[PDB]
Amino acid sequence: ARYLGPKLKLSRREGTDLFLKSGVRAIDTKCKIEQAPGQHGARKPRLSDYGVQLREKQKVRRIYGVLERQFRNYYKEAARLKGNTGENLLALLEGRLDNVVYRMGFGATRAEARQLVSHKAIMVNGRVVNIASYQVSPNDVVSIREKAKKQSRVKAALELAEQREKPTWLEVDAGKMEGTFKRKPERSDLSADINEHLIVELYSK
Amino acid sequence: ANIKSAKKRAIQSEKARKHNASRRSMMRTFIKKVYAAIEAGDKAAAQKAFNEMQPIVDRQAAKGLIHKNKAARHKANLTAQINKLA
């Protein structure tokens, strides 16, 4: 139910950094970042219209750690919801607990944050939530529970976090290891070389 | 029958059947006497017979052997015809 294999392969295939490692290292010193995996990585894909749509959807999925079934269901919900579907898809992803745990800096990666969640190290409103896809709401307070507070992963995670751009819609107290999901992120909060409308196109045909 | 009470019910329903049959046969007899008088043209015999019949079609109604409406028609019908002749 989770992708467990090599991670930089995914970045290499999509042509971009997917933040699947902590960021302690320039990614180009860990892999040949600008070349696809495999014997024929140097080869260029003269890539069809379907192809660009597929790869964009894969990219987003691989960023958030979501497999097809759940992600399709995410599209369905984005569509059902009011307002722009493409933007609704990203709101839903960005509201996941494993994700939010990552953005408050409690985990070096979404993979690490997910493990924190699954392993009962995260509370929401002082209540233990251990499922990664838990949808987090405005004004919620997610926190590292007392017993998980001395984990060195978390301190390192918060350090790296302090060096990333700081997300607007979250208020994080690094000392308490608690943080507040102030509001749903706008579209403008999220990276601009994500092409949701391509993903929207892939799932309407 | 297979079930204990099913057996008992068949026994009771047979008893009731022979009870009802007996009273019902009696009743129709007393109804038939009236129609027979009518068909012979006698007011008195037919009125007399109607008077014997009345209390028993009424009673068998009260006793559930027949419904009230049946008792009534019989009285209505015979009364109609006997009057129409004398």
Place this chain on the structure above:
Amino acid sequence: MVTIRLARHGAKKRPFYQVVVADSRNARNGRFIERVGFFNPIASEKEEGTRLDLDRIAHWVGQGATISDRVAALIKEVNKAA
């Protein structure tokens, strides 16, 4: 006769009852005449959990409808609540 009782809906281990007026012979979750309340035994009790249209319940009693042991309890409980 006509009776007022609980038809058990909800899910496994999470009972949820629909209070209904019905011909007592029909199945518990089958044909009914009128729906008249509900009863959640698993309500958090932070908010609601038991709602009865007492006006229509009484109307039906006035016309001879009987009442479950469990509905007879709910009614005394709800009458106490307010």
Place this chain on the structure above:
Amino acid sequence: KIRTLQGRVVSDKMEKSIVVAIERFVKHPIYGKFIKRTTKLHVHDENNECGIGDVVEIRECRPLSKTKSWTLVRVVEKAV
């Protein structure tokens, strides 16, 4: 409260009965054209006052025979 039908007499042969035809236009469920439909009713005519071709007003009543559940109310127009 007098529910009623209007139609014309297609047969007056029977003793104290009549056959009445009620005709109406109806939208076709699929192709939209308006189609003629007819409903023939066996109706009671005590006194046989209804002639064939007459236009008559009829009403629904209890069963009068295997096929009669309607009786005559009154004649409207006659002998065209």
Place this chain on the structure above:
RNA sequence: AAAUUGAAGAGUUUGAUCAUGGCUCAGAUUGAACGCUGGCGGCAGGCCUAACACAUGCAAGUCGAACGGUAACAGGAAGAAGCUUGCUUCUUUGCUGACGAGUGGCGGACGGGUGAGUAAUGUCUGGGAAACUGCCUGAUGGAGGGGGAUAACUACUGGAAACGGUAGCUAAUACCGCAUAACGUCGCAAGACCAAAGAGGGGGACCUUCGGGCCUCUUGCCAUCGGAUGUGCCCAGAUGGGAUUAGCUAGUAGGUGGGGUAACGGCUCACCUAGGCGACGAUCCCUAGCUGGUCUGAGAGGAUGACCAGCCACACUGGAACUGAGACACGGUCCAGACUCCUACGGGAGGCAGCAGUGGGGAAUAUUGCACAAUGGGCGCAAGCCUGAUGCAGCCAUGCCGCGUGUAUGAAGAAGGCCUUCGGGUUGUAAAGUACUUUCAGCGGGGAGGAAGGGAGUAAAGUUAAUACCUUUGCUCAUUGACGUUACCCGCAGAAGAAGCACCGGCUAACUCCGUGCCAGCAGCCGCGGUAAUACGGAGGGUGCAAGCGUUAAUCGGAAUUACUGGGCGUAAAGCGCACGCAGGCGGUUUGUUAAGUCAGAUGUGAAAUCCCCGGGCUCAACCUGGGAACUGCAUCUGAUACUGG
């Protein structure tokens, strides 16, 4: 506030083209199966085939507060004794807590199963009038005085069994007279006529035949008029196909009268009239349970009727009625048929389309489980008893949803493999190493909720002669969970036990080498294979999915490819060889009228669930749930009169 605010195209005829036209693909969906693989959980689903046949258990009982009663076990007792003098065992007696068999009452018409039959004594929508209706309910009165029986039992007797035969004998809320009898039935009326049943709980003077009287309350019984629920009946529209089926019909269509039903009715019979149905599809033939809804589609449609709910029909096959408020009875009766079982050979017995289970058929569909704790049904004043309804558990990846199978760091980037022009590229931060976490599975510890009630006491009110009893409502005490090792929470051990499947020529995301050589083989469509095959088969690499993945089957979509919305017929499939013409469709222009079509409004109905919208509850989700909106439909009334019809 919101609540249908939604719609894609690709390959393939040709040397190439445009058109025509079929085939094929991308999508959703499934009660699925098979092949490979397979960790946990929540919720759902699970004989689609043979309405084939079924061993065994279980699935309908209950009331001693209707009745005679004791045979079991349980006490109790004058009196027998265990006697070691209060502990007792048996002989006895229903004395009573109870209770086998029996009469009696209520239930066995519900609940549960199936879809064979049925194109209509069906269903859906909407209306009618001639009716019954247990239990529950409001109203008003009865509940008087008698009689003959009978099961059980007793004696004698026949049977292998099933089950009988004689004569005794006895009870009742079993059964029948008699009285009483109207706001009931018949009748214009005068009049005439119809019923019943007791049983318990407690008790003050009072007293006897010590049974009770009598006092009191509960409950059942009878009558009549209502309510509520259920059911029967009637009309209209709609609800499959076929003309290689065009005529059908004697109870047939109607009328009169008798009979009949709970009730209208050719329901039935006699007589009379000669009708009734049919091209607006009768008759005949094929098929089929109908609906809410389900799947698909932007919609209009198309397909469909498991799981949930409503109606119908059936209960081995054909027929029949008896009992009953209700049945022509799913675990009742009778007859006939098919079939099976028992037998001492003479005779008997049974009907899983209830729940498990078996054989058979099949590509294929589960345990001969636990519990009445909860909801609900039957009986009972109750306690309670019964409940394969139901709640649960087992089995299966069948589906949906959730989670895991680790996280981070880790380079000249090892070995091995693979490609290479031998420079190197790749597998690949992948692995090893380094720290780090412990969900789930394992193991110990603790521990919600589904529980409302019911039981003893108590107190107050209504009762009443009464502080009894009864009933209601408060109080305290001790109690009721099949699931269950529950949900959930804490602790321990270690990355430890948890990854496979299909694909990579174009459509279509993913390319190379070796082997083979029109072979072996692939193939949804085009089309691959005779020496460079990205198409066969293996490998390395890659793509897509992931506890699944593929293949097959199946509906709709794309298919504007049955075209109502939404197409065509000169040469592509398609104008009858030509004309006349009935039915039918359509019909110039003016006025008046009508108001069926059409339009408007109002009212009722359109079950709930489902779908959709906004909320609420399970850690999330599936799932459960509140309210709304929607059900685009039907019907009645009242209007409007331009258009269509008269």
